Enzyme design. Structure first.
Site, PDB file in Angstrom:
ATOM      1  N   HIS A 232       0.833  -1.210   0.000  1.00 19.28           N
ATOM      2  CA  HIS A 232       0.000   0.000   0.000  1.00 19.28           C
ATOM      3  C   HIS A 232       0.863   1.254   0.000  1.00 19.28           C
ATOM      4  O   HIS A 232       0.663   2.158  -0.812  1.00 19.28           O
ATOM      5  CB  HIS A 232      -0.941   0.024   1.218  1.00 19.28           C
ATOM      6  CG  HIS A 232      -1.873   1.202   1.250  1.00 19.28           C
ATOM      7  ND1 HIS A 232      -3.216   1.095   0.955  1.00 19.28           N
ATOM      8  CD2 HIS A 232      -1.660   2.506   1.550  1.00 19.28           C
ATOM      9  CE1 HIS A 232      -3.788   2.282   1.065  1.00 19.28           C
ATOM     10  NE2 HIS A 232      -2.866   3.156   1.424  1.00 19.28           N
ATOM     11  N   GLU A 236       1.454   3.914  -3.296  1.00 17.09           N
ATOM     12  CA  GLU A 236       1.163   5.339  -3.221  1.00 17.09           C
ATOM     13  C   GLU A 236       2.395   6.176  -3.539  1.00 17.09           C
ATOM     14  O   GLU A 236       2.324   7.133  -4.308  1.00 17.09           O
ATOM     15  CB  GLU A 236       0.630   5.693  -1.835  1.00 17.09           C
ATOM     16  CG  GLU A 236       0.344   7.171  -1.638  1.00 17.09           C
ATOM     17  CD  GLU A 236      -0.815   7.691  -2.490  1.00 17.09           C
ATOM     18  OE1 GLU A 236      -1.696   6.885  -2.904  1.00 17.09           O
ATOM     19  OE2 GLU A 236      -0.833   8.923  -2.742  1.00 17.09           O
ATOM     20  N   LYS A 239       3.184   6.086  -7.297  1.00 16.36           N
ATOM     21  CA  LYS A 239       2.262   6.890  -8.092  1.00 16.36           C
ATOM     22  C   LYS A 239       2.690   8.348  -8.080  1.00 16.36           C
ATOM     23  O   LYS A 239       2.727   8.998  -9.124  1.00 16.36           O
ATOM     24  CB  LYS A 239       0.811   6.733  -7.626  1.00 16.36           C
ATOM     25  CG  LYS A 239       0.185   5.415  -8.067  1.00 16.36           C
ATOM     26  CD  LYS A 239      -1.311   5.386  -7.769  1.00 16.36           C
ATOM     27  CE  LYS A 239      -1.587   5.371  -6.283  1.00 16.36           C
ATOM     28  NZ  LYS A 239      -3.063   5.255  -6.041  1.00 16.36           N
ATOM     29  N   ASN A 240       3.015   8.866  -6.899  1.00 15.62           N
ATOM     30  CA  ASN A 240       3.466  10.248  -6.798  1.00 15.62           C
ATOM     31  C   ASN A 240       4.784  10.492  -7.522  1.00 15.62           C
ATOM     32  O   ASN A 240       4.929  11.488  -8.230  1.00 15.62           O
ATOM     33  CB  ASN A 240       3.588  10.667  -5.334  1.00 15.62           C
ATOM     34  CG  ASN A 240       2.235  10.855  -4.667  1.00 15.62           C
ATOM     35  OD1 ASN A 240       1.550  11.850  -4.906  1.00 15.62           O
ATOM     36  ND2 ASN A 240       1.862   9.919  -3.812  1.00 15.62           N
TER      37      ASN A 240
HETATM   38  O1  LIG Z   1       5.453  16.900  -4.476  1.00 14.20           O
HETATM   39  S1  LIG Z   1       6.309  15.993  -5.201  1.00 14.20           S
HETATM   40  O2  LIG Z   1       7.608  16.568  -5.300  1.00 14.20           O
HETATM   41  C1  LIG Z   1       6.223  14.406  -4.494  1.00 14.20           C
HETATM   42  C2  LIG Z   1       5.333  14.172  -3.426  1.00 14.20           C
HETATM   43  C3  LIG Z   1       5.260  12.907  -2.865  1.00 14.20           C
HETATM   44  C4  LIG Z   1       6.073  11.877  -3.357  1.00 14.20           C
HETATM   45  O3  LIG Z   1       5.997  10.627  -2.804  1.00 14.20           O
HETATM   46  C5  LIG Z   1       6.954  12.093  -4.392  1.00 14.20           C
HETATM   47  C6  LIG Z   1       7.017  13.380  -4.965  1.00 14.20           C
HETATM   48  O4  LIG Z   1       7.927  13.607  -6.019  1.00 14.20           O
HETATM   49  N1  LIG Z   1       5.840  15.912  -6.783  1.00 14.20           N
HETATM   50  C7  LIG Z   1       4.541  15.354  -6.977  1.00 14.20           C
HETATM   51  C8  LIG Z   1       4.137  15.853  -8.322  1.00 14.20           C
HETATM   52  C9  LIG Z   1       3.056  15.518  -9.123  1.00 14.20           C
HETATM   53  C10 LIG Z   1       2.965  16.187 -10.358  1.00 14.20           C
HETATM   54  C11 LIG Z   1       3.875  17.150 -10.783  1.00 14.20           C
HETATM   55  C12 LIG Z   1       4.940  17.489  -9.995  1.00 14.20           C
HETATM   56  C13 LIG Z   1       5.041  16.815  -8.744  1.00 14.20           C
HETATM   57  C14 LIG Z   1       6.092  16.964  -7.703  1.00 14.20           C
END
Ligand SMILES: O=S(=O)(c1ccc(O)cc1O)N1Cc2ccccc2C1
Ligand SMILES: O=S(=O)(c1ccc(O)cc1O)N1Cc2ccccc2C1
Lengths: 363, 363
Positions: A232, A236, A239-240
């Site tokens: 999980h 997540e 995906k980010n």
């Molecule tokens: O804020 S983050 O830096 C970011 C947040 C959480 C994570 O796990 C990894 C990350 O890299 N990042 C999420 C995201 C989505 C679309 C466009 C630009 C960004 C930048």
């Protein structure tokens, strides 16, 4: 026939939940002797955990408590508590008691399946109906961390009982894998996130995994854990990281990979996911764990899973470059103890907040 | 002749400190017109800042307040406040007023030179005399962050006035460099830490610097900052990173380098220092910023310097591998605003803590 629910809630909320370690969960057997013990334990422990958190629901601001979705969730908790009260005078020696108990736990699990998005609708209802305010917001944040962690713990107890005393892997003890290969779970989560990223962007970053087994450099890193929870969190995070990488590289055909390091130390098993997705200013990090801004609870719920067995999930970005996310887990099953909120005076005082100027200056 | 100090403390503690931005500091001139303005500002602002923090000293536990070293520091603050009170009725138009004021500020700065280690002796005295307790410890931690940040801010005001209205670099405005080359400061701090590491271990890790200027990939990264503060932070971080690297590699002739990334984004200027010194379990991270465990205030004071202009200093380790330390600074002088503690009801309630069971479970 049963007493009114408040009489049970008052009775059971006097007790503190009893945290179990991963080792205790793992060392629990599957015999009839063990099933009776699990029954006699859970008909006390589940009411204690249900009552403790229901008492805290009552501390929420009237505004949040008044919402239909919060009232609905409350009503589920009440019925689930009463379902278990039906078993207070039943004989563990009677096999029908045990089988009926398992059925009741399954019914409770199903009843509560949609708790997370239903509570989120409650937050939205509060926002829409009244507008949000800082005091209510801080109380909601404090409460929801505890409410969702409580829920994770109740589901853990129920899944362990139903899985053990009813497949895919007989070596698991309920939902626990005593030999979870961490890199294999990383790869599984990557694979699933890649399917999603490829669907929407027609491309995705590659994965690179490095292991650092400090005490045994040769050895593949394993641990005792619930693989579904680890999956999980990693899903997540991938995906980010994938979205950041693709969205920050719109003009590029070459995507920087996502790099994962799995390190095993004396006390910690740490998993770092590093992306070059351009990052986010420090000011905006806190929002990523906020239920209010997120109304999309992927990150805060993932961090709760990490915290549940005394771990954590932390984010550190470099704006203009990328972001590191780190999952901290306990390396040893004996250190992996449930982290459970408890209803007491300290908890109660936290909700007793009011609107005022803070202890730091404004210009 | 002056009123008793408490009458001044009560009067000035009613006001809130007034935070200045780096741009405001930088845009201040050196004319006689400007000196009078600085005088009339500081004879109000310095008493406000002194009084605000002196009121919080009084909220400390009797045990800590009773120590000779805390009483000594208190006595310095009292005399410094009274020194400034001598100027309340003086004429800014008289050049002797201005010159006497500068002399008084220099005397105050010297008087307070040893405040940090003197307060640390107070903490030790409390520990030795009474033994430490969790409630007092949390109050001390809260207080010392605010006390030392207050002190940083008072020294900033005094240095700006004395430097401007009295060399090495005439382009500086007091202690502020409008064009601070960040990598140059990194190198200076590395050089000094290397001298120390080489002295004790006869070896030290090499340095590698990478810059990521997001908006202007070519351009060397510069900012408006106080180079001495940035140097302070980096020197402390290099000392820790070097010691970790050498001590975790006792059997090795080849040392992994310390890698520094300087990233410039739209809002943040971030500096990451990465070592392969074997790291530290998550459980032990908090201790690194604790004044109690540190009685060695290098890390907590460094983080205060970062926080002073709305930045931060964060540590993230991977036990078995190494540690990343990140200094977060504001990229823009307009966002770089003093972070000042203020004495008010919110501040006051923080000290109103008592011994009880926490809101989380014990086994
Ligand atoms: O804020 S983050 O830096 C970011 C947040 C959480 C994570 O796990 C990894 C990350 O890299 N990042 C999420 C995201 C989505 C679309 C466009 C630009 C960004 C930048
Ligand atoms: O805890 S640390 O991980 C560590 C702490 C702060 C820092 O800036 C860098 C670091 O690397 N580290 C300090 C130190 C000293 C001697 C021997 C082993 C270690 C490990």
């Amino acid at each position: 026939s049963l007493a009114g629910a408040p009489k049970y809630i008052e009775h059971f909320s006097k007790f503190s939940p009893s945290p179990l370690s991963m080792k205790q969960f793992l060392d629990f057997g599957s015999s009839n002797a063990c099933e009776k013990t699990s029954f006699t334990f859970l008909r006390q422990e589940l009411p204690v955990r249900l009552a403790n958190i229901m008492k805290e629901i009552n501390l929420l601001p009237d505004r949040v408590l008044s919402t239909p979705s919060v009232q609905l969730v409350q009503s589920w908790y009440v019925q689930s508590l009463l379902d278990i009260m039906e078993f207070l005078d039943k004989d563990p020696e009677d096999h029908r008691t045990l089988s009926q108990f398992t059925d009741a736990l399954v019914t409770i699990r199903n009843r509560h399946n949609d708790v997370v998005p239903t509570m989120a609708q409650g937050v939205l209802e509060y926002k829409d109906t009244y507008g949000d305010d800082p005091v209510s917001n801080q109380n909601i944040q404090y409460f929801l961390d505890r409410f969702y962690l409580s829920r994770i713990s109740i589901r853990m107890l129920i899944n362990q009982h139903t899985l053990i005393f009813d497949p895919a892997h007989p070596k698991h003890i309920g939902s626990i894998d005593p030999n979870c290969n961490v890199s294999e779970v990383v790869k599984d989560a990557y694979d699933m996130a890649k399917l999603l990223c490829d669907k929407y962007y027609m491309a995705s970053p590659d994965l690179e995994i490095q292991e650092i087994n400090a005490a045994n450099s040769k050895q593949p890193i394993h641990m005792v854990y619930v693989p579904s929870h680890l999956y999980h969190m990693l899903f997540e995070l991938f995906k980010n990281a994938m979205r950041a990488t693709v969205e920050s590289h719109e003009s590029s055909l070459i995507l920087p990979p996502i790099k994962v390091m799995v390190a095993l130390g004396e006390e910690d098993l740490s998993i770092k996911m590093s992306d070059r997705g351009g990052g986010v200013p420090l000011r905006k990090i806190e929002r990523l764990f906020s239920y209010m801004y997120s109304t999309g609870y992927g990150l805060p719920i993932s961090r709760l899973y990490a915290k549940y067995f005394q771990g954590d999930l932390q984010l550190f970005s470099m704006e203009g470059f990328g972001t590191d996310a780190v999952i901290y887990l306990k390396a040893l099953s004996t250190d992996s103890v449930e982290r459970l909120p408890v209803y007491n005076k300290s908890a109660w005082r936290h909700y007793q907040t009011i609107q005022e100027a803070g202890d730091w200056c404004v210009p």
